[PDB]
């Protein structure tokens, strides 16, 4: 029916500490990593698209294209040079999902981000669907040779400004990210067909819900699954010209809630209502300290 008392964060917090809320899926995107220094994609100001000028490209959205990459892999590796952050420090929001994992509530984190911050916060591969791949490993692009390289090796080059070539054969080696023109990993489809039968709560954070097929995951849940969006803008509402998106505001709204603000602040507030505020503050502070001693 309508599983939330109210369509607010308080409604979602009460629902979460109830009977019916056992399995939680997170859909996350670049918004949850901006406060760790990793810029946005589509934000007007600091977004990646309004900063692809000095990369001499035929058009902005062309440096994550696979066939252009194998043609000229140098602009992308130059881009990774500029973006590659000094420290890898996951945000409050990342640690919020770690709490969900530790409390037995996280069924899966579906992420569009390539920065590996879900792993450093302590989500394990079983927990994650890296829907656009990852920077954490790299593979030679051949086939005869698909030799896997770690991030430590792929980081020496990029910063030694040397284009990474396989050591066994002499082929290009590419971070395990999914460029445009590539298919999403099989794991994505296998998890989607099973995870969304089960799910009792959808948590969407820091994503504009524009790229597909990732955006459509919100409609894979049963119609009674409450869906909370933490984002600084609303997203996932049907375009009025097309024709199960998000409905926060119509009179037919019954399960979608939009908390508008910083993902870090939305997760602080949700954790506070849940009794986890201190536990969360201690975890972040403990882990940021352990990372600052490296
Ligand atoms: C490890 C080193 C990393 C450096 C290397 C960088 C190379 C990256 C290459 C990526 C290639 C993978 C394929 C790809 O590009 O997919 C991209 C991306 O995965 C996909 C999905 O887009 P996305 O994750 O949804 O990112 P968007 O920019 O579209 O959405 C950001 C949303 O979030 C909001 N927001 C922003 N900040 C906050 C914040 N602090 N708090 C709350 N909300 C925030 C923004 O207002 C906005 O609504 O569109 C893009 O193709
Ligand atoms: Zn090779």
XYZ file of C-alpha atoms and ligand atoms in Angstrom:
346
model
C 0.000 0.000 0.000
C 1.754 3.061 1.433
C 4.492 1.791 3.739
C 5.639 5.166 5.100
C 3.713 7.076 7.748
C 4.812 10.330 6.184
C 6.769 11.238 3.089
C 9.735 12.688 4.981
C 13.089 11.628 6.391
C 11.365 10.933 9.712
C 8.947 8.649 7.879
C 11.903 6.808 6.308
C 13.779 6.530 9.615
C 10.765 4.954 11.366
C 10.281 2.600 8.442
C 13.940 1.595 8.516
C 13.914 0.520 12.160
C 10.757 -1.537 11.553
C 9.961 -5.170 10.789
C 9.471 -4.685 7.087
C 12.865 -3.038 6.348
C 15.487 -5.757 6.018
C 17.159 -5.199 2.618
C 18.431 -1.840 1.361
C 19.852 -1.015 -2.072
C 21.886 2.163 -2.650
C 22.074 3.819 -6.075
C 24.856 6.376 -5.941
C 26.693 8.654 -8.302
C 29.230 11.460 -8.438
C 27.375 13.663 -5.986
C 28.530 11.491 -3.084
C 32.184 12.017 -4.003
C 32.301 15.786 -4.692
C 32.914 16.508 -1.030
C 36.020 14.295 -1.301
C 37.400 16.561 -4.028
C 36.378 14.425 -7.018
C 34.463 16.826 -9.252
C 30.976 16.335 -10.565
C 29.978 15.426 -14.108
C 26.974 17.687 -14.876
C 27.104 20.422 -12.212
C 27.199 23.777 -14.038
C 30.086 25.211 -12.074
C 32.689 22.549 -11.222
C 31.276 19.859 -13.503
C 33.545 17.868 -15.786
C 31.704 18.903 -18.942
C 32.258 22.646 -18.497
C 35.967 21.953 -17.883
C 36.934 19.838 -20.941
C 38.239 22.931 -22.783
C 42.032 22.606 -22.652
C 41.708 18.953 -23.730
C 41.725 19.795 -27.428
C 38.822 17.374 -28.076
C 36.514 17.205 -31.120
C 33.666 17.606 -28.604
C 33.435 17.531 -24.764
C 31.738 14.144 -24.286
C 34.261 12.212 -26.385
C 37.183 11.505 -23.994
C 35.382 8.546 -22.380
C 34.736 6.908 -25.777
C 36.457 3.553 -26.266
C 37.320 3.780 -29.953
C 38.626 7.314 -29.544
C 40.603 6.005 -26.561
C 42.397 3.299 -28.537
C 42.902 5.830 -31.347
C 44.334 8.563 -29.069
C 44.649 7.410 -25.449
C 46.664 10.481 -24.432
C 43.933 13.064 -23.614
C 42.174 10.631 -21.271
C 45.407 9.807 -19.453
C 46.135 13.531 -19.274
C 42.654 14.012 -17.776
C 43.314 11.263 -15.229
C 46.570 13.100 -14.499
C 44.710 16.289 -13.524
C 41.911 14.511 -11.654
C 43.860 11.852 -9.775
C 43.365 12.951 -6.147
C 46.189 13.162 -3.636
C 44.465 11.117 -0.942
C 41.589 8.662 -1.261
C 39.304 9.675 1.634
C 35.679 8.462 1.431
C 32.976 10.803 2.662
C 30.456 10.696 5.504
C 27.989 9.442 2.927
C 30.363 6.594 1.993
C 30.709 5.691 5.645
C 26.940 5.843 6.040
C 26.734 2.954 3.576
C 29.437 1.189 5.591
C 27.157 1.446 8.646
C 24.348 -0.099 6.618
C 26.717 -2.927 5.680
C 27.857 -3.480 9.272
C 24.258 -3.468 10.564
C 23.224 -6.173 8.122
C 20.892 -3.903 6.139
C 22.850 -3.304 2.933
C 21.823 -5.726 0.199
C 23.836 -3.971 -2.489
C 25.476 -0.691 -3.437
C 25.014 0.087 -7.120
C 27.497 2.807 -8.011
C 28.289 4.762 -11.145
C 31.537 6.183 -9.688
C 34.966 4.906 -10.730
C 36.931 6.335 -7.769
C 36.880 3.156 -5.547
C 35.765 5.082 -2.475
C 33.097 2.480 -1.677
C 35.913 -0.061 -1.225
C 38.144 2.123 0.923
C 35.155 2.825 3.201
C 34.943 -0.933 3.532
C 32.327 -2.153 1.109
C 33.503 -5.452 -0.318
C 33.158 -6.645 -3.894
C 30.190 -8.820 -2.879
C 28.426 -5.638 -1.731
C 29.174 -3.591 -4.845
C 28.006 -3.371 -8.417
C 30.525 -1.042 -10.044
C 28.135 -0.312 -12.902
C 30.702 1.770 -14.850
C 33.699 -0.323 -13.872
C 36.509 0.785 -11.628
C 39.910 2.461 -11.566
C 41.077 -0.087 -8.983
C 42.413 -2.564 -11.530
C 43.660 -2.273 -15.101
C 43.913 -4.792 -17.899
C 45.893 -5.002 -21.082
C 43.410 -4.390 -23.919
C 44.412 -7.386 -26.061
C 42.639 -10.749 -25.560
C 45.515 -13.127 -26.054
C 46.881 -11.125 -23.125
C 44.526 -9.786 -20.509
C 47.168 -9.260 -17.834
C 45.712 -7.488 -14.772
C 47.626 -4.544 -13.305
C 46.929 -2.909 -9.926
C 46.232 0.750 -9.361
C 49.724 1.318 -7.924
C 51.284 0.430 -11.274
C 48.673 2.374 -13.301
C 49.372 5.396 -11.076
C 53.155 5.554 -11.637
C 52.435 6.111 -15.281
C 49.783 8.854 -15.638
C 51.984 10.787 -13.238
C 55.208 9.739 -14.852
C 53.133 10.902 -17.868
C 53.994 7.642 -19.657
C 51.183 5.948 -21.580
C 50.750 2.535 -19.905
C 51.692 -0.391 -22.133
C 51.487 -4.068 -21.236
C 54.737 -5.604 -20.063
C 54.104 -9.067 -21.557
C 52.869 -7.922 -24.951
C 53.288 -4.253 -25.893
C 49.550 -3.399 -25.988
C 47.712 -0.534 -24.330
C 46.543 -1.160 -20.776
C 43.264 0.457 -19.740
C 41.761 1.032 -16.277
C 38.870 -1.379 -15.703
C 36.411 1.479 -16.213
C 33.594 1.175 -18.735
C 34.111 3.728 -21.510
C 31.248 4.854 -23.706
C 30.971 2.305 -26.485
C 31.504 -0.570 -24.045
C 28.965 -2.874 -22.472
C 28.284 -2.862 -18.754
C 29.691 -5.829 -16.798
C 27.684 -9.033 -16.755
C 27.534 -8.814 -12.964
C 25.319 -5.734 -13.281
C 22.592 -7.644 -15.129
C 22.870 -10.737 -12.955
C 22.487 -8.733 -9.731
C 19.683 -6.546 -11.048
C 17.485 -9.505 -11.975
C 17.729 -10.812 -8.443
C 18.300 -7.832 -6.116
C 15.160 -5.926 -7.032
C 12.821 -8.788 -6.157
C 13.890 -8.455 -2.525
C 14.407 -4.811 -1.835
C 12.546 -3.025 0.994
C 14.072 0.442 0.572
C 15.802 2.264 -2.288
C 18.340 4.931 -1.323
C 19.411 7.191 -4.216
C 22.214 9.678 -3.656
C 24.258 12.160 -5.635
C 23.073 11.075 -9.055
C 21.044 12.964 -11.649
C 19.440 9.743 -12.927
C 20.019 10.616 -16.571
C 22.401 7.941 -17.869
C 20.888 4.553 -18.725
C 20.435 1.707 -18.085
C 21.455 2.828 -14.580
C 18.595 5.315 -14.175
C 15.987 2.641 -14.868
C 16.977 0.619 -11.787
C 14.599 2.734 -9.669
C 11.683 1.240 -11.597
C 12.909 -2.338 -11.094
C 11.767 -2.294 -7.451
C 8.241 -3.338 -6.458
C 5.769 -0.448 -6.446
C 5.523 -0.570 -2.656
C 9.283 -0.152 -2.013
C 9.854 3.317 -0.487
C 12.472 5.315 -2.373
C 14.446 8.112 -0.692
C 16.508 10.545 -2.769
C 19.355 12.475 -1.149
C 20.634 15.022 -3.625
C 20.993 18.728 -3.881
C 18.313 18.785 -6.607
C 15.352 16.596 -7.442
C 15.944 13.903 -10.085
C 14.259 10.896 -11.648
C 10.880 12.492 -12.333
C 9.339 11.498 -15.670
C 9.847 13.972 -18.485
C 6.381 15.396 -19.313
C 6.979 14.684 -23.021
C 7.818 10.963 -22.730
C 4.519 9.133 -23.238
C 7.856 4.650 -13.357
C 9.879 7.684 -12.373
C 9.967 9.434 -9.056
C 6.852 11.144 -7.806
C 7.570 13.333 -4.774
C 4.888 15.981 -5.162
C 1.774 14.972 -7.122
C -1.348 14.004 -5.225
C -0.524 10.456 -6.331
C 2.765 10.568 -4.363
C 2.950 7.701 -1.833
C 6.500 6.336 -1.431
C 9.086 8.784 -2.814
C 10.845 11.300 -0.555
C 13.265 14.000 -1.624
C 15.720 15.358 0.908
C 17.466 18.252 -0.829
C 20.936 19.263 0.314
C 24.433 17.859 0.763
C 24.666 14.072 0.707
C 26.938 14.303 3.755
C 24.312 16.343 5.593
C 21.384 14.167 4.509
C 23.239 11.109 5.793
C 24.075 12.859 9.043
C 20.400 13.730 9.554
C 19.170 10.267 8.638
C 21.757 8.679 10.963
C 20.754 11.039 13.782
C 17.079 10.044 13.576
C 18.323 6.449 13.634
C 20.463 6.681 16.767
C 23.671 6.240 14.699
C 24.985 9.817 14.808
C 27.802 9.205 17.297
C 28.544 5.768 15.864
C 28.871 7.415 12.440
C 30.921 10.368 13.694
C 33.281 7.952 15.464
C 33.689 5.766 12.390
C 34.510 8.588 9.968
C 36.871 10.204 12.474
C 38.574 6.874 13.199
C 39.004 6.095 9.495
C 40.057 9.551 8.334
C 42.677 9.451 11.064
C 43.891 6.031 9.995
C 44.160 7.323 6.449
C 45.952 10.535 7.498
C 48.707 8.297 8.960
C 49.907 6.909 5.656
C 40.494 7.297 -9.574
C 40.889 8.535 -10.352
C 39.677 9.240 -10.931
C 40.098 10.220 -12.075
C 39.732 9.665 -13.492
C 38.376 10.291 -14.036
C 37.898 9.557 -15.267
C 36.371 9.279 -15.108
C 35.813 8.566 -16.362
C 34.365 8.036 -16.104
C 33.928 7.093 -17.276
C 32.746 6.147 -16.802
C 31.457 6.404 -17.660
C 30.892 7.810 -17.230
O 31.454 8.787 -17.528
O 29.678 7.929 -16.452
C 29.551 9.241 -15.797
C 28.888 9.106 -14.671
O 29.236 7.818 -13.990
C 27.441 9.024 -15.219
C 26.496 9.144 -14.217
O 26.397 10.489 -13.844
P 26.133 10.900 -12.300
O 26.830 10.028 -11.307
O 24.655 10.968 -12.030
O 26.852 12.372 -12.118
P 25.953 13.712 -12.438
O 26.936 14.880 -12.537
O 25.129 13.495 -13.686
O 24.933 13.944 -11.160
C 25.461 14.615 -10.052
C 24.256 14.803 -9.090
O 24.661 14.847 -7.847
C 24.312 16.306 -7.301
N 25.342 16.590 -6.380
C 26.575 16.902 -6.711
N 27.265 17.050 -5.561
C 26.438 16.804 -4.536
C 26.627 16.812 -3.176
N 27.833 17.118 -2.405
N 25.629 16.516 -2.370
C 24.389 16.222 -2.886
N 24.204 16.216 -4.212
C 25.241 16.513 -5.036
C 24.330 17.085 -8.395
O 23.498 18.315 -8.172
C 23.657 16.202 -9.422
O 22.312 16.133 -9.254
O 27.418 10.211 -16.259
C 28.621 10.210 -16.769
O 28.575 9.651 -17.998
Zn 49.259 -7.799 -22.776
